[PDB]
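worker-03 picked up job from queue 'complexes'. Input manifest follows; three sequence lines, order preserved.
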Amino acid sequence: DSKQHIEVLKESLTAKEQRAAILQTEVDALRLRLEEKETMLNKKTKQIQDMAEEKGTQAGEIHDLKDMLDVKERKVNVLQKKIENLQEQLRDKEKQMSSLKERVKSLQADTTNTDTALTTLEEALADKERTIERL
Amino acid sequence: SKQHIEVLKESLTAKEQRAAILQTEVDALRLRLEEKETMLNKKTKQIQDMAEEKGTQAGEIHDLKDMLDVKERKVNVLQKKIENLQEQLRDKEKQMSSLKERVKSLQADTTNTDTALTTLEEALADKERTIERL
Amino acid sequence: ILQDIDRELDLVERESAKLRKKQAELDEEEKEIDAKLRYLEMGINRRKEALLKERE
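worker-03 finished. Artifact:
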């Protein structure tokens, strides 16, 4: 009567504990999974942080090698113009020497001949002056 | 019985309120857990993307170093060509110096004292003209 | 007619003096270029060796 009413209510209690205990276990297991994920999220954030810095510095290296190729291409072209310049220099020396060789070609063995003829005649005139001094 | 019945009624109301709060507990934790999983997935995909971007940045750096080597080889070849031409110029400048000094030896046409001989001949002809005069 | 050969030599010597001056310009430009190359090389080495001392 009341006796069976009490037994019904006692059961309803047992059932409500069973529900609440199951729920309690869900909750604290769910709290586990959330803390493990918080830690994982933290690890990932840190990897991304480090990796963004590696990216920044590798971008810097890349800008620097791009600049060096620009500058080294400048060097190559300058050396090319140096070579072209030096080759003109050699051509000019070689022209100068052609002219210097033609200058040398101008030579005269005929002027020594007049030299000796004139010399003897001056001293023949000296002979004549000595004989006219004698009187 | 009279008092025990009311004990059980209170315990019932309390445990039911407990279970309702615990249920909202759970459904909230499950939502938050899902949000954490999607953030986590999003970060993982990002980490792959950045690792790929890093590999391609490394390849870019490797390729740029090779290209600088190729230009360095070309530079060295040009440097040797400049050195060879500089030696060529040194030898030509010496030869041209030798030719210029030969010219100076030849250039010295002191033979132009032809005029000295001639002028002396007319001075001495003057002398014996005046002396035949006396 | 040797004076003609002389004015030809003078003309070519003017030209070669000009080429020497162009040459010394170009060499100043290579000295510039090499200073930028050293600057770039040292900037690269410093970034690397900063990361190196950091990782220790």
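worker-03 released lock.
Residues 2-134 of chain A form one domain.
Chain A touches chain B through 76 residues (CB under 8 Å).
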